[PDB]
């Protein structure tokens, strides 16, 4: 249990242990540019690449215990809500009573196997709903059709399929898998350090300040791929006309005495275009067989020009709203908290007029009359309060809570409004 | 009125969980049914309290 | 102090012209339109240098033969597989390039590594395009409004 | 503008009614009412 006592110590120390993990990876991938059969040299110290053989090991074990604290930090929390869900669910609808979830919705379908675990509601402290619904709904049915539905030597004495159920929940966290990815990224790049740099990806979840930037486009990216999905095909349109009518203007050739190259084969003329003409930028009238005297030149004259805008007006109108119209929403959304936080209440949601009709009141009205986290403190307290020694109120809203009803809340109808 | 114990305030004050409240806030000024806004808020209360139970044994 | 030594040597007495910054108050609208923002600004380029530092090493592993500053090889022909200059080549050239990186490579015609080179400029091209623009544009516009 | 116009549906759809076009204050002076007020008292496709 000293180990378990020590396990709490890394539960204590995660985020500092998280933060130093990158501080390995800089000097890791700082000296990975210090390479040159692949040679590495020394410049100042005595034993440098020996200390490389230290650090890659050293990073990897750092990449271990951070997830284990996380395995005891977030995993019991996120297992709880899913556990909180189904206990709230099966009382409220009884889908395994009635609905038996459909061909989609794998989540409860994964939990189609947890419902007959005998040590089921581990972290949700209301074990009786395993039998209360057998009294509530299983009244309407046979008890046994619900009781078979519901209910050293350590090698044989666990809720065996429950942990087996539990893993298919824990892999449905990205961040765990992202850390598990980071651990798999820890192994093989340590095994070969031409591939141990992409631990520097972890700046993405690194400075939270940065995540504003990627969210300013990762919210948008569903629309993004359509644009380039348009882009490749219009040049695929645009290639075939010259492939029909200008293919003689297509030399990668050095003066023809070379093995002079055209673009009228299977499929490369187009692949030429998107490789060159998109990476060109300066139009397509920079790489064609440059004309002086054709009459097809007239049709070539127009050809670059409408292509030029369809360089210009396409790619810009791709990226600009992607770089700007994406942005101002996040400028808006960070504004958007600052209205109800200022104007109205959260709880009674009324306005700043009424509670600063009284001088200085609305702050205090939000700090006495509504003071939201008081309710949190409150709901802890009644939970730890005896039911028998409830007050009238402590009985009352308990019963309100027990049916998940919430009509006690001072909705838009606060105190002093009806007074004088 | 009622009592507020002190130890729960000590579990309350962490900017970790204060920030979870903050992103929760920014989430719920955005999307969510109002008649269930306080519902999901309640569930948020439940899990955050349970979290402070976790933070207790540390 | 700028008054003294540039007076003592007038290859360095011009930066009194910096004082236009606190000069026309009309101008200070412009610098404030970015000096309010600059805390976010350096992160962007702080991202920028490392992704090419990612992007350099693959060609340093797999395309290093496509890296000639060389004049036809009979010269003292130069590669980019030394200590740390291939990357410094990239950020000096390919960022100051603009027209992609498929403008300065050993230009391909017939490799099968060319296929991996074909894709190489192209995703780099957007990561010229979609990176630097999305750096500067909100920096020039979302800063403004 | 298209960012605005897709915003622009989300005002009267939220604030007022369509039909009586009044506001969210009055029909959520009653708790939870304005939804139902738009789903009983006005519930547009009922008219259809
Ligand atoms: Ca009593
Ligand atoms: Zn209130
Ligand atoms: Zn109406």
DSSP A418: G
A210 and C47 Cβ atoms separated by less than 8 Å:
yes
Q: How far apart are CA A300 and CA A369, in angstroms?
A: 76
Q: Is A373 on the interface with B (CB under 8 A)?
A: yes
Query: Rounded to an integer, what distance in angstroms lies between the CA atom of residue D13 and that of residue D2?
Result: 18
Any chain A CB within 8 A of the CB of D11? no
- Cα of D25 vs centre of ligand 2, distance in Å, is 15
Q: Which long-range contacts (CB under 8 A, 24 or more apart) does A210-215 make?
A: A210/C43, A210/C47, A212/A330, A212/C40, A213/C40, A213/C43, A213/C44, A213/C47, A213/C134, A215/A330
The tokens of C23 are what?
């000069």
What are the tokens at A287?
A: 């790489």
Question: Which runs of consecutive H residues, i.e. helices, occur in A284-411?
Answer: 296-323, 327-336, 352-355, 361-364, 373-384, 392-402
Task: Determine the Cα–Cα distance for residues A196 and A185; give it in Å rounded to an integer.
Answer: 7
Looking at the DSSP bridge assignments, the partners of residue A35 are A40
Angle (nearest 5°) at CA A412 between A408 and A418: 90
Residue of B nearest to A333 (CA): B26
D10 touches chain B (CB under 8 A): no
Among A290, A283, A287, residue whose Cα is nearest residue A304: A283
How far is ligand 2, taken at its centre, from the CA of residue A205, in Å?
36
C-alpha to C-alpha distance for A31 and A55, rounded to whole angstroms = 11
Residue numbers preceding breaks in chain A (C to N > 2.5 A): 36, 151
Inter-residue long-range contacts of B11-20, CB under 8 Å, 24+ positions, other chains counted: B11/B52, B11/B55, B11/B56, B12/A373, B12/A376, B12/A377, B12/B52, B14/B55, B17/B48, B17/B51, B17/B52, B17/B55, B20/B48
Write a three-state SS string for chain C: CHHHHHHHCCCCCCHHHHHHCCCCCCCHHHHHHHHCCHHHHHHHHHHHHHHHHHHHHHHHHHCHHHCCCCCCCCCCCCCCCCCCCHHHHHHHHHHHHCCCCCCCCCCCCCCCHHHHHHHHHHHHHHHHHHHHHHHHHHHHCCCCC
Q: Return d(Cα B52, Cα B16) in angstroms, integer.
A: 11
Burial code of A327-342, b = ≥16 C-beta within 10 A, e = fewer?
Answer: bbebeeeeeeeeeeee
User: Cα of C44 to ligand 2 centre, how many Å?
Assistant: 41
Residue of B nearest to A72 (CA): B54
Q: How far is CA D5 from the centre of its chain?
A: 17
The encoded tokens of residue A223 equal: 């629309």
Q: Is A314 helix (H, G, I), strand (E, B) or coil?
A: helix
State in Å, rounded, how far the first CA of chain B is from the last one: 30
Contact B39 A374 (CB under 8 A): no
Q: Yes or no: say if A121 and A127 are a contact pair by the CB < 8 Å rule.
A: yes
Radius of gyration of chain D (CA): 12
Cβ-Cβ pairs closer than 8 A, A with B, add up to 64
CB atoms within 10 A of CB C47: 17
Instruction: Give the distance (Å) from ligand 2 centre to CA of residue B37.
Output: 14
Sequence-distant (≥ 6) Cβ neighbours of residue A341 within 8 angstroms: B25
- The reported resolution of this PDB entry, expressed in Å, is 4.4
Alpha-carbon gap, residue A177 to A173, rounded angstroms: 6
Interface contact B12-A373, CB threshold 8 A: yes
Tell me which residue of A207, A180, A204, A199 sits closest to A30, measured CA to CA: A199
* Owner of token pair 């005896």: A386
Q: Work out the burial of residue A145: count CB atoms within 10 Å of its CB; fewer than 13 is exposed, 13-18 middle, 19 or more buried.
A: exposed
State both tokens at B55. Answer: 């933070």
Per-residue burial over A255-267, b = 16 or more CB atoms within 10 Å of its CB, e = otherwise: eeeeeeeebeeee
What does the alpha-carbon distance between residue A265 and residue A272 come to, in Å, rounded to a whole number? 11
- Out of A325, A407, A412, the one facing D28 most closely (by C-beta) is A412
Distance CA C28, CA A33 (A): 42
The DSSP H or E segment spanning A49 is: helix A49-92
DSSP A161-199: HHHHHHHHHHTT-HHHHHHHHHHHHHHHHHH-TTS--GG
Residues ≥6 apart with Cβ < 8 Å to A124: A80, A83, A84, A87
Q: How far is CA A358 from the centre of its chain?
A: 44
Per DSSP, the three-state class of A352 is helix
Instruction: Please give the backbone phi and psi of residue A337, each rounded to the nearest 5 degrees, phi first.
Output: -70, -25
Residue C50's beta-bridge partner residues? none
Q: Could you tell me the sign of the dihedral formed by the alpha carbons of C145, D3, D8, D11, in that order? A: negative
The whole-angstrom separation of Cα A351 and Cα A360 is: 14
Contacts of residues A286-291 at CB distance under 8 Å and 24 or more positions apart, as own/partner, are A288/A246, A288/A249, A288/A250, A289/A248, A289/A249, A289/A250, A289/A251, A291/A249
Buried b (16+ CB within 10 A) or exposed e, A98-133: eeebeeeeeebeebeebbebeebbeebeeeebbeeb
Q: In angstroms, how far is CA C6 from the centroid of its own chain?
A: 32
DSSP A208-236: TTTHHHHHHHHTTHHHHHHHHHHHHHHHH
Distance CA A60, CA A221 (A): 33
Helix (H) or strand (E) holding A144: helix A143-147
DSSP 3-state of A58: helix
Contact between chains at B3 and A381 (C-beta distance less than 8 A): yes
Tokens 């007006």 map to which residue? A313
Containing H/E element for B40? helix B37-56
CA of A9, closest CA in chain B: separation in Å?
A: 8
Among A306, A63, A321, A18, CA closest to A186: A63
Cβ contacts from A onto D, under 8 A: 12
- What residues contact residue A382 under an 8 Å CB cut-off, 6+ apart? A390, A394, A397, A398, B2
What is d(CA A335, CA B55) in angstroms, rounded to the nearest whole number? 32
**Distances, alpha carbon A391 to alpha carbons A394, A397, B2, in Å:** 5, 10, 11
Degrees to nearest 5, angle at CA C130 with A186 and A221: 75
Give the chain D residue whose CA is nearest to the CA of A409. Answer: D31
PDB experimental method? cryo-EM
Strand partners, A40: A35
Mention every residue, 6+ apart, whose C-beta is less than 8 A from residue A56. A28, A189, A190, A193, A196
Q: How many residues does chain C have?
A: 145
Is residue A133 within 8 Å of A88, Cβ to Cβ? no
**Separation CA A146–CA A90 (nearest Å):** 13
- C9 to A155, A170, C17, C20: CA distances (angstroms): 85, 70, 16, 22
Q: How many CB atoms lie within 10 A of CB B30?
A: 10
- Mark the breaks in chain D: residue after which each occurs, C to N over 2.5 Å: none
Chain D's closest residue to B37, CA to CA, is D32
Q: Which residues are CB-neighbours of C21 under 8 A, at least 6 positions away?
A: C27, C28, C31
Measure the CA–CA gap between C91 and C68, rounded to whole angstroms.
16
Residue whose token pair is 């990561």:
C127
Residue A413 to residue D29, Cβ atoms within 8 A? yes
CA nearest neighbour of C66 among C28, C17, C116: C116
- Nearest to A273, CA basis, from A314, A295, A309, A243: A243
How far is the C-alpha of A92 from the C-alpha of A98, rounded, in Å? 11
d(CA A311, CA B40): 49
CA C44 to chain centre: 12
Which chain D residues are closer than 8 Å to A326 by Cβ? none
Decide: C and B in contact? Rule: 3+ Cβ pairs under 8 Å.
Answer: no
Backbone interruptions in chain B following residues (C to N > 2.5 Å): none
């Amino acid at each position: 249990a000293y180990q378990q006592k020590l396990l709490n110590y890394f539960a204590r120390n995660f985020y500092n242990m998280r933060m130093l993990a990158l501080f390995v990876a800089f000097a890791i991938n700082f000296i990975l540019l210090f390479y040159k059969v692949h040679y590495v040299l020394e410049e100042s110290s005595g034993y440098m690449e020996p200390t490389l053989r230290i650090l890659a090991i050293l990073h990897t074990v750092i990449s271990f215990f951070c997830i284990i604290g996380y395995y005891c930090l977030k995993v019991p929390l996120v297992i709880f809500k899913r556990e909180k869900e189904v206990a709230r669910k099966l009382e409220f609808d009884g889908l395994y009573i009635t609905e038996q979830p459909s061909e989609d919705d794998i989540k409860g379908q994964w939990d189609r196997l947890v419902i007959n675990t005998q040590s089921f509601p581990n972290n949700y402290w209301d074990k009786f709903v395993k039998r209360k619904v057998m009294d509530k709904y299983g009244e309407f049915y046979g008890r046994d059709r619900i009781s078979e539905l519901l209910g050293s030597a350590v090698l044989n004495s666990i809720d065996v399929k429950y942990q087996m159920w539990k893993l298919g929940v824990v892999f449905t966290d990205n961040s765990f898998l992202y850390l598990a990815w980071y651990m798999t990224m820890s192994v093989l790049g340590h095994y070969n350090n031409f591939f141990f740099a992409a631990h520097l990806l972890d700046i993405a979840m690194g400075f939270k300040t940065l995540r504003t930037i990627l969210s300013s486009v990762t919210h948008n990216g569903k629309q993004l791929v359509l644009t380039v999905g348009l882009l490749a095909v219009v040049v695929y349109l645009y290639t075939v006309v010259a492939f029909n009518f200008f293919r003689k203007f297509y030399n990668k050739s050095e003066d023809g005495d070379t093995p002079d190259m055209k673009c009228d084969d299977m499929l490369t003329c187009y692949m030429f275009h998107m490789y060159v003409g998109v990476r060109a930028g300066g139009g397509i009238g920079d790489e064609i067989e440059d004309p002086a005297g054709d009459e097809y030149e007239i049709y070539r004259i127009i050809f670059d020009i409408t292509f030029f805008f369809f360089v210009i007006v396409i790619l810009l109108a791709i990226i600009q709203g992607l770089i700007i119209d994406a942005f101002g929403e996040l400028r808006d959304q960070q504004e958007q908290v600052k209205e109800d936080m200022e104007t109205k209440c959260f709880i009674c949601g009324i306005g700043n007029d009424y509670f600063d009709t009284v001088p200085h009141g609305f702050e205090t009205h939000t700090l006495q009359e509504h003071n939201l986290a008081n309710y949190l403190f409150f709901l802890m307290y009644l939970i730890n309060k005896d039911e028998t020694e409830h007050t009238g109120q402590e009985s009352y809203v308990w019963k309100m809570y027990q049916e998940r009803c919430w009509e006690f809340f001072p909705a838009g109808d606060c105190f002093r409004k009806q007074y004088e | 009125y009622f009592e507020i114990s002190e130890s729960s305030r000590t579990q309350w004050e962490k900017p970790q969980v204060k920030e979870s409240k903050r992103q929760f806030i920014f989430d719920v000024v955005n999307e969510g049914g109002e008649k269930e806004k306080m519902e999901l808020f309640v569930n948020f209360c439940e899990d955050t309290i349970f979290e402070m139970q976790l933070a207790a044994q540390i």
